Amino acid sequence: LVPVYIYSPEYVSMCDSLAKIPKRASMVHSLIEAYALHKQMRIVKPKVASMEEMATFHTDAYLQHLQKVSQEGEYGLGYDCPATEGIFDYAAAIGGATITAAQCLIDGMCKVAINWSGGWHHAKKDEASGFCYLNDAVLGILRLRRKFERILYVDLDLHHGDGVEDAFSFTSKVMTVSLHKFSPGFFPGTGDVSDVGLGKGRYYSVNVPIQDGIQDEKYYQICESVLKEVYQAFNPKAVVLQLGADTIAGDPMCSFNMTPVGIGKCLKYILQWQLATLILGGGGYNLANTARCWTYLTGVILGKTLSSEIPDHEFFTAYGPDYVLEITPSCRPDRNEPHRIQQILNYIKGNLK
């Protein structure tokens, strides 16, 4: 009944090695521990994914190439996803952790299982993309489908959850919902509100394009409106929730103007459904703020209010100069015009009935 927390020292050390987010996994874990939240969770060591498990989504040829590059030094590698030594073992660890979380849920060990180091939502069956070499979210959804008939995937990262959406574009058994920045030239370029899925999957992809500067109140109003409609229309049996913290004020992506409180309200709205829920991280490039966000959201999962004062711990100096948990929104414009948001929400509302 207690939430599962996917963690081991070797897993955190592996995750600390991704160059866009050095030490982020240790920062997240050590802040969670500084707030004593691990004592309220069941710690489960992640398994490493086998190539057989990875091949439930990724192609045989992509997995051969990933292994080759990982040993030696095409398929989306080189720029955002450099072809570097060890990438296959890193992929296998992250994929394995999300699979392990899903297995805990299908086994009934818990109703919430947390892998903050997962959420690599851009990777495609045969292409690395957007820092993502393996789509652990897809692998977790596929594992949940062993026991749960309909899976709802909700993606609150700043970026469109394109790889997950594409994986399930043609099916009605998985519904994907992404809220994201959508603007010319902004990665990955997809996910306008008219992106609804294909074939029998038509209307089983939902996309909410949002502009710079959104704040907690409006974001929650949007998310709540969409999720209420999705729940009633789709009746999910399990949820996979990607909580990339690159929406939070102070992120180098410098787009949205959110705080963890607003994301937390979205999370609580989903938790009220009392379904098996797999919690993932994702983006989040202000490392201390990402740790603040995911620690706060762990508290939300546990029903716990945390002290504003960051407890002393190994990474204390990263939390200066304020050393508090709350994040102050920046002073920038909210570029979301009310009547454009109305148009977006009304379109989605009609598509879901």
Binding site: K20, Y79, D80, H122, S129, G130, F131, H159, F187, P188
Partner: peptide, 4 residues
């Protein structure tokens, strides 16, 4: 970055 490049890219994303």
């Amino acid at each position: 970055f490049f890219x994303x």
